[PDB]
């Protein structure tokens, strides 16, 4: 079986720049060596195969090398939209395989969280569960702090958060951070605050709401 | 060809079967080779297998031989896979993927994906709540809008604002698995305040697997 | 190459009966001609070497002649202990060779099966598979059929059977036959039967159980 | 009294070689000539070649020259022969077997056998699964019982009960392949129903080549 090797597992650079992914085959593939660009839950596409031929459509900026045992994906200029995992692939062998994938992210200058808070709907509270909500929108770099205090007291283990894609246009992250409290629990407390700490922001931010 | 269109999305108990179609929508599967590769959770694109109809020929990765049969009907010109005795480890989307029938060629066409969750689990079907901002929150010009989408089972729910007209400033967050082994997610847009003057803000939300189609407009408190 | 012919490939014998083997070499291989009994997933046994002498241990109902080409093995009182494969083999040219062996099957009274059916076990229901077993045993001749039937519909290519070897005691077979179904279409039927038809019974034999206890 | 004792089953690629053990305990190979001799599935003893150490002397059958080499260590008292270039015919139970050095002699001990399995397949271990009646089924005075041995590759798979104290009724079929390109196998007993009340029934499996080993009550 042939073991396909991408090196680096992630990659962040500018608008412009230009990146190089490698791919090592275990053993000689000779030209059989093919490229994909994938989107989260998106379909795969074919940038180059055969080493060095670029797929119709795709931008000049991308360009395939290599031969036997060692590859390179270049992109020249890197642009928002090419925020993507990376593929290699060989169609050598009898069984096919897939390198593990490089992630390519973008580098752009700070921008601080917009950051707004949502008490639990009073359709939620009747059936015995507070979820209170804090987002934080178009902010870079993804590195963020999100802490809940109910009348000051920090919680623990009761809040989950999620992440958006890293924007195609952008470059920006989106965040949301859920507390979970039974009714119980949520009628007992009047301050609801969420705390943000990121590198854009001099102080932390807090937005709150009382019960 | 064109486009390969795949099956919605499946769940499935663990020990049983899924059969997912890929449709050559606006062409054909004569003289190529129809692959099918899965990519678990957080994990890359693994192969799975290949058929080239033309050679009457049939290839699996060692760890998908005898689990993995993939068959090509050209009456209704579709590629079926059939994963059987499922197991929590099968949960993943599965990708067909075309190449030419010659040695070496790569995968030029991909379907979409078909997400496949294996679980006993029961499915369940959100409770959809408004994401309603403050008056002194939308005071500043900027109005957070949203709808929070608890405690469902299984993946996927989908979320559209105003019936597919809002997309822009549209950031629906992946769904988290929470202690309860259910999944809640939230949808939010962010719009200018005095547009909630001018328009409705509603959240369509559809969790096809317990035929739930709820929409709920949003306005701040 | 010395060449090694036996005859006949089977038999069939009762209880009691005289039972005589025959082995020929292409050479005369003087009296260097050994005999091996072999029971299924045992080793070879030898029981008479140089022809005629027995291994110790081996009882004398087994005796062995001949020379040069033709050689007999001989039971003079078969047993139920000695259904096996008989192999004769020479040892005397450096290429040593052995005869396509001789397998001794008993012929005895016809005896219907014992059916026993075996719901899946909860443990491998957990991990979503339901193998439902049924056991036919104890029984004679071998030819035996199971059908399973599913709220009576009659099942196809879902079920393997594997048979025992002839019992050394009593002469006997015994059949397992699995059904395999995902735990989600076990969940959806009430009655699994299974129908076995054998030589013993004039009509065949249900057996069955009602998932959930009915 | 001399035992040979072989080494385990084992899969192995196509294409690959095999190496197997003969360890004489309670004797030597020393003043001894040793066979291997193979036995392919359903089919008759086939014999391999043969070295005499104490005479410094081999011999391979025609079918085997270049394909299979037979050695000895006496230092260890082990036996080995190798078979290279592996196809899914070389698949079956190898045995060793001793005779004397003298000319003509019979082969008197023989090992336990090794199966070979000549598969690209993985090694797995078994799920043990119990075999138990409907509580009426016991209600008849005869209870059945058994354990199913399910999805492992290559073969084989060991089955005692209550340790080897239960022996009589037991019955251990042949393996069956699945479609999945895995064994499983059943085990079963008759016993008393009421002994069911008096004592418990465990199935012990081994499945060496995947180092699984399960011990398994069964109850209704």
């Known amino acids: 079986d042939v073991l396909m090797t991408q090196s680096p597992s992630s990659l962040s650079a500018s608008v412009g720049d230009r990146v190089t992914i490698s791919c090592r085959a275990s053993?000689?593939?000779?030209?059989?060596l093919n490229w994909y660009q994938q989107k989260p839950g998106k379909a795969p596409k074919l940038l180059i195969s055969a080493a060095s031929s670029l797929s119709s459509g795709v931008p000049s900026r991308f360009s395939g090398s290599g031969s036997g045992t060692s590859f390179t994906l270049t992109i020249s200029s890197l642009q928002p939209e090419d925020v993507a995992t990376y593929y290699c692939q060989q169609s050598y062998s009898f069984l096919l395989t897939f390198g593990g994938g490089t992630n390519v992210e973008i580098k752009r200058t700070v921008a601080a969280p917009s950051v707004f808070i949502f008490p639990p709907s009073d359709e939620q509270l009747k059936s015995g569960t507070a979820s209170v909500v804090c987002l934080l929108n178009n902010f870079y770099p993804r590195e963020a702090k999100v802490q809940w205090k109910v009348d000051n007291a920090l919680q623990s283990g009761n809040s989950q958060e999620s992440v958006t894609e890293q924007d195609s246009k952008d470059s920006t992250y989106s965040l949301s951070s859920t507390l979970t409290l039974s009714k119980a629990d949520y009628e007992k407390h009047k301050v609801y605050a969420c705390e943000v700490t990121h590198q854009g922001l001099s102080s932390p931010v807090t937005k709150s709401f009382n019960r | 060809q064109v486009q390969l269109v795949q099956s919605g999305a499946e769940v499935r108990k663990p020990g049983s079967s899924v059969k997912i179609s890929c449709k050559a929508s606006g062409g054909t599967f004569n003289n190529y080779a129809l692959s099918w590769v899965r990519q678990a959770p957080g994990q890359g694109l693994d192969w799975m297998g290949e058929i080239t109809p033309i050679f009457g020929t049939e290839k699996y990765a060692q760890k998908f031989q005898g689990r993995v049969t993939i068959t090509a009907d050209e009456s209704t010109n579709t590629l079926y896979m059939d994963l059987s005795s499922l197991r929590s480890e099968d949960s993943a989307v599965y990708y067909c993927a075309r190449r030419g029938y010659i040695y070496g060629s790569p995968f030029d066409y991909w379907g979409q994906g078909t997400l496949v969750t294996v679980s006993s689990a029961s499915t369940k079907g959100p409770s959809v709540f408004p994401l309603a901002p403050s008056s002194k929150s939308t005071s500043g010009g900027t109005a957070a809008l949203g709808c929070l989408v608890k405690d469902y089972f299984p993946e996927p729910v989908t979320v559209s604002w105003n019936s597919g007209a809002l997309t822009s400033g549209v950031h629906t967050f992946p769904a988290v698995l929470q202690s309860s082994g259910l999944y809640s997610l939230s949808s939010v847009v962010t719009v200018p305040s005095s547009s909630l003057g001018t328009q409705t803000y509603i959240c369509n939300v559809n969790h096809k697997p317990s035929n739930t189609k709820v929409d709920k407009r949003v306005e701040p408190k | 190459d010395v060449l090694m012919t036996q005859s006949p490939s089977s038999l069939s014998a009762s209880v009691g009966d005289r039972v005589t083997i025959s082995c020929?070499?292409?050479?005369?291989?003087?009296?260097?001609?050994?005999?091996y009994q072999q029971k299924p997933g045992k080793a070879p046994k030898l029981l008479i070497s140089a022809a005629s002498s027995l291994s110790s241990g081996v009882p004398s109902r087994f005796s062995g002649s001949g020379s040069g080409t033709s050689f007999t093995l001989t039971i003079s009182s078969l047993q139920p202990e000695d259904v096996a494969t008989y192999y004769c083999q020479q040892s005397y040219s450096f290429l040593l060779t052995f005869g396509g062996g001789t397998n001794v099957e008993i012929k005895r009274t016809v005896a219907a099966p014992s059916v026993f059916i075996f719901p899946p076990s909860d443990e491998q229901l957990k991990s979503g598979t339901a193998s439902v077993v049924c056991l036919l045993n104890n029984f004679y001749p071998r030819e035996a059929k199971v059908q399973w039937k599913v709220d009576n519909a009659l099942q196809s290519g879902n079920s393997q059977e594997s048979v025992t070897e002839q019992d050394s005691k009593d002469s006997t077979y015994s059949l397992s036959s699995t059904l395999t179904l995902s735990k989600a279409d076990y969940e959806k039927h009430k009655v699994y039967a299974c129908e076995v038809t054998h030589q013993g019974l004039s009509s065949p034999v249900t057996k069955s159980f009602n998932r959930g206890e009915c | 009294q001399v035992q040979l004792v072989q080494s385990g089953a084992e899969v192995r690629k196509p294409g690959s070689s095999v190496k197997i053990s003969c360890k004489a305990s309670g004797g030597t190979f020393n003043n001894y000539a040793l066979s291997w001799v193979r036995q392919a599935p359903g089919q008759g003893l086939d014999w391999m070649g043969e070295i005499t150490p104490i005479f410094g002397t081999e011999k391979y059958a025609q079918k085997f020259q270049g394909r299979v080499t037979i050695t000895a260590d006496e230092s260890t008292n082990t036996l080995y022969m190798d078979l290279s270039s592996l196809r899914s015919e070389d698949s079956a139970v190898y045995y060793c077997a001793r005779r004397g050095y003298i000319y003509g002699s019979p082969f008197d001990y023989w090992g336990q056998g090794t199966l070979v399995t000549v598969s690209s397949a993985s090694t797995k271990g078994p799920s043990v699964f119990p075999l138990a009646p409907s509580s009426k089924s016991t209600s008849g005075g005869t209870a059945a019982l058994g354990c199913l041995v399910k999805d492992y590759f290559p073969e084989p798979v060991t089955v005692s009960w209550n340790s080897g104290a239960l022996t009589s009724g037991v019955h251990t079929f042949p393996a069956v392949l699945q479609s999945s390109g895995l064994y499983s196998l059943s085990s079963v007993v008759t016993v008393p129903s009421s002994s069911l009340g008096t004592q418990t029934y465990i199935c012990n499996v081994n499945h060496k080549p995947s180092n699984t080993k399960v011990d398994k009550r069964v109850e209704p």
């Open positions: 053993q000689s593939i000779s030209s059989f």
